Amino acid sequence: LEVDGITETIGTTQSAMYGGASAQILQINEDIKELLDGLRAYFGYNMIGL
Amino acid sequence: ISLNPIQDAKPIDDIVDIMTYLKNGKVLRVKQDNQGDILVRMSPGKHKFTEVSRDLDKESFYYKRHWVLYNVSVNSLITFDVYLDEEYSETTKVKYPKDTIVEYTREDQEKDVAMIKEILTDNNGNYFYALIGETMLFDENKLNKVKD
Amino acid sequence: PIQDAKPIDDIVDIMTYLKNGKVLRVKQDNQGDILVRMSPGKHKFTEVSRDLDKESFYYKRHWVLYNVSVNSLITFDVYLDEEYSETTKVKYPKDTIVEYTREDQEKDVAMIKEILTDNNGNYFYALIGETMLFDENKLNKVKD
Amino acid sequence: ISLNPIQDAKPIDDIVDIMTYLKNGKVLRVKQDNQGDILVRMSPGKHKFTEVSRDLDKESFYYKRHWVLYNVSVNSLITFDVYLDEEYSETTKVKYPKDTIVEYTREDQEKDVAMIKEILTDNNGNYFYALIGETMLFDENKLNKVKD
Amino acid sequence: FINDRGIKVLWEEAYFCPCLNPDTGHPRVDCPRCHGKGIAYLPPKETIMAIQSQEKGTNQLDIGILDTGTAIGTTQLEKRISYRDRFTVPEVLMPQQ
Ligand SMILES: [Zn+2]
């Protein structure tokens, strides 16, 4: 904005290709991938005979 | 084969009753000509003061109305028509409300003026109007409102 | 006893008196006393006047509009103007904090709520949270 | 079933005692109205001067307090309430401290005014208040502080 | 934006006092409405406003020293201001001797 010589300016994380919270979402996914895969080893793979 | 009559929201005209409802804690709804339509409430508990909110809807379990302190003015209440929240609602936004004077076309091809005295809607949403001096009910498309 | 003060409790009564058109008197904290009024005529709106003294041949009250808030009315003390007495000549007014010694000669703080007098002007005070009377000498003003 | 009484930090009122503690080398803690809360110390060793620090915490093995020279003013000590570090702490930030006068609700539905004379907390952290003219102890939510 | 940048201020409108002498067209020296100034004022209204270039211009004269300050203000929407209206900023203090 510009009013009588006063101007207020802002640039944000929102972008045409990424959302505002996409950065945190990306980090969250990164944490989950390590966490989820590590938790899978606690249970192991399934198996059925045939 | 129609829905029962639907009542219009009565604006409260006298200040004394409005304050009386407010003292009891019943919510008011005020329309400001310039800015917005707002709710007014006197604070619960012993810490008494006036509160204002803009969360214009019934207090659903998933819709929590939020309140903030404001110094409401007496003149604001007087000049602006005010309603009780329990009546003012989307349930009826009739084009011509009750007590409205309209010009309606008669069988003799003469346009007479009459007041709406009763309102009800069919299952399809068309509003049926009862008019002074007439027995049957009238339809919205047939009517004309003369302003000024 | 003296009846110099007749505070209004319910705002509904205040509005009712305002509808009747009688002038009010509203106290303020560390600020000048004010009078309030409902305007006559077609348009009804609140008016205020900083003039306290009685209407007279040499003194006329000056009224102007204002957007008064109910919050001041509901909280601050309110009176009918004509019924108000300017002062009650006592050492410690009501709602004034004093230090007093209880019945067991232990000292406690209290605020005053009473107006009693003989026909000579001797005054007595009853403290909030207390029953019996206390004299002008017994009580001691609590400094801010 | 409660914790023993917790003492309030006593502001030091007289200049003479404050200097006496300072000469011994005991640390002071001063609150500045404008800028900050600071510690004050007279330098160890023979090279004597006043020192100021902003490392507001107990001298833990992993928290080394750092000092810098400053020309502390007499008037600063007088006007600003000062404490001894050994008392002023997070151990008690009670809402109503000792010697505070409060308005409390009595059994007879009368609000009387009384001073807090003793303070202790239950294991859950709720502060119990002893009041003049009353035997039992009172809870924070019940109380009201009247200011001015 | 105006509320964000502005400073809280009291606003009172101006109107010519009735005390003006009808013949000389000039006012009484002392009346409650105006204390010698030829213009009265209305009850205060609260508002947020922006101000720039606050200047204390001082003139040293035969009559003495005198202050002629100048400043530029930016207001809110829907507010109509009048000539010789009056603003006062309680928060800001000015030194004098
Ligand atoms: Zn004048």
The oligomeric state of the chains shown is part of a larger assembly
Q: Give, in spatial order, the strands making up the sheet with the most strands of chain E.
A: 7-4-1-8
Which structural class best describes the helix and strand composition of chain E? mainly beta
Query: What is the number of strand segments of chain A?
Result: 2
Pattern of helices and strands of chain A: EEH
Most extensive chain contact? B-C, 16 and 17 residues
Overall outline of chain A: rod-shaped
Radius of gyration of chain A from CA coordinates: 23 Å
Q: Please state roughly what percent of the residues of chain A sit in beta strands, choosing from under 5%, 5-15%, 15-25%, 25-35%, 35-45% or over 45%.
A: 5-15%
Terminal CA distance of chain A reads: 71 Å
Distance between the termini of chain E: 37 Å
Envelope shape of chain E: globular
SSE string of chain E, helix = H, strand = E? HEEEEEEEE
Small molecules in complex: zinc ion
Number of helices of chain A: 1
PDB class: virus
Keywords: phage, neck, connector, tail, virus
Entry title: Neck-tail junction of phage 812 virion (C6)
Chain A: Putative neck protein
What does this structure look like?
- This is part of a larger assembly, with one copy of chain A (50 residues), three copies of chain B and one copy of chain E (97 residues).
- By secondary structure, chain A is mainly alpha-helical.
- Chain A contains one helix and two strands; from the N terminus they run E-E-H.
- Chain A has one helix at residues 22-43, and strands at 2-3, 6-7.
- In chain A, a hairpin with a 2-residue loop joins strand 1 (2-3) and strand 2 (6-7).
- By secondary structure, chain B is mostly beta strands.
- Helix content of chain B is 11%, strand content 30%.
- Chain B contains two helices and ten strands, in the order H-E-E-E-E-H-E-E-E-E-E-E.
- Chain B has helices at 15-24, 74-79, and strands at 28-31, 37-42, 50-53, 68-69, 82-84, 101-105, 111-121, 127-131, 137-138, 143-144.
- Chain B is elongated and about 65 Å long.
- Chain E is mainly beta and 97 residues long.
- At the C-D interface, strand 7 of C face strand 7 of D.
- The complex binds zinc ion.
- Chain E: This is Capsid protein.
